[PDB]
Amino acid sequence: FERINDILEHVKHFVINLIGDFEVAEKINAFRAKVHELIERYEVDQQI
Amino acid sequence: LGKLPQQANDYLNSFNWERQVSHAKEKLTALTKKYRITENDIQIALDD
């Protein structure tokens, strides 16, 4: 199964890289940024 | 009797919009840091 082991190692590398390429952390950071611009745009401070 | 209107005015003054927006800026700082996901930690866990 040594060939199987090497193939599994390569497949694990590919899966980890693919998941890393589509991690939600970047999406969440972008969403927090968007929230920042929305809050600054709609001017809660002036309202208070 | 006189202390009452003075007490109400002092209560209004102490907790004015200044403190409210100070706490709002604290919340926005939390958004800037605490609500962000460190993609670096994500990739470190993936590599581990």
Coordinates of C-alpha atoms in Angstrom, one line a residue:
Chain A
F1 CA 0.0 0.0 0.0
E2 CA 3.0 2.3 -0.2
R3 CA 1.8 3.6 -3.6
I4 CA -1.6 4.0 -2.0
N5 CA 0.0 5.9 0.9
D6 CA 1.8 8.3 -1.5
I7 CA -1.4 8.8 -3.5
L8 CA -3.3 9.6 -0.3
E9 CA -0.6 12.0 0.7
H10 CA -0.9 13.9 -2.6
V11 CA -4.7 13.8 -2.4
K12 CA -4.6 15.2 1.1
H13 CA -2.3 18.0 -0.1
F14 CA -4.6 18.8 -2.9
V15 CA -7.7 18.9 -0.6
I16 CA -6.0 21.1 2.0
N17 CA -4.9 23.5 -0.7
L18 CA -8.4 23.6 -2.3
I19 CA -10.0 24.2 1.1
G20 CA -7.4 26.9 1.8
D21 CA -8.3 28.6 -1.5
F22 CA -11.9 28.9 -0.5
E23 CA -11.7 29.7 3.3
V24 CA -14.6 31.7 4.7
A25 CA -12.2 33.8 6.8
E26 CA -11.6 36.2 3.9
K27 CA -15.4 36.4 3.3
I28 CA -16.0 37.2 6.9
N29 CA -13.3 39.9 6.9
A30 CA -14.8 41.4 3.8
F31 CA -18.3 41.4 5.5
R32 CA -16.9 43.1 8.6
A33 CA -15.4 45.7 6.3
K34 CA -18.7 46.2 4.5
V35 CA -20.4 46.7 7.9
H36 CA -17.8 49.3 8.7
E37 CA -18.5 51.3 5.6
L38 CA -22.3 50.9 6.1
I39 CA -22.1 52.2 9.7
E40 CA -19.9 55.1 8.7
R41 CA -22.1 55.9 5.7
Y42 CA -25.5 55.9 7.6
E43 CA -24.0 58.1 10.4
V44 CA -25.2 56.7 13.7
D45 CA -23.1 59.3 15.5
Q46 CA -25.0 62.2 14.0
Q47 CA -28.3 60.5 14.9
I48 CA -27.3 60.1 18.5
Chain B
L1 CA -37.2 69.8 45.9
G2 CA -34.5 71.8 44.1
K3 CA -32.2 68.8 43.9
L4 CA -34.7 67.0 41.6
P5 CA -34.3 69.2 38.5
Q6 CA -30.6 69.5 39.1
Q7 CA -30.4 65.7 39.5
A8 CA -32.3 65.2 36.2
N9 CA -30.1 67.7 34.3
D10 CA -26.9 66.1 35.7
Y11 CA -28.2 62.7 34.7
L12 CA -28.8 63.9 31.2
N13 CA -25.4 65.6 31.0
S14 CA -23.3 62.7 32.4
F15 CA -24.4 60.1 29.9
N16 CA -24.6 62.3 26.8
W17 CA -23.9 61.3 23.2
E18 CA -20.1 61.5 23.9
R19 CA -20.0 58.4 26.0
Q20 CA -22.5 56.7 23.7
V21 CA -20.2 57.2 20.7
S22 CA -17.2 56.3 22.8
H23 CA -18.7 52.9 23.4
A24 CA -19.8 52.8 19.7
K25 CA -16.1 53.2 18.8
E26 CA -15.2 50.5 21.2
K27 CA -17.7 48.2 19.5
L28 CA -16.3 49.3 16.1
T29 CA -12.7 48.4 17.3
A30 CA -14.0 45.0 18.3
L31 CA -15.5 44.7 14.8
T32 CA -12.1 45.7 13.3
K33 CA -10.3 43.1 15.4
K34 CA -12.5 40.8 17.5
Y35 CA -15.0 40.1 14.7
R36 CA -12.2 39.4 12.2
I37 CA -11.1 35.8 11.4
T38 CA -7.3 35.6 11.2
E39 CA -6.7 33.8 7.9
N40 CA -3.1 33.3 9.2
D41 CA -4.3 31.1 12.0
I42 CA -6.6 29.3 9.4
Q43 CA -3.6 28.5 7.2
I44 CA -1.4 27.6 10.2
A45 CA -4.0 25.0 11.3
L46 CA -4.3 23.7 7.7
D47 CA -0.5 23.3 7.5
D48 CA -0.5 21.6 10.9

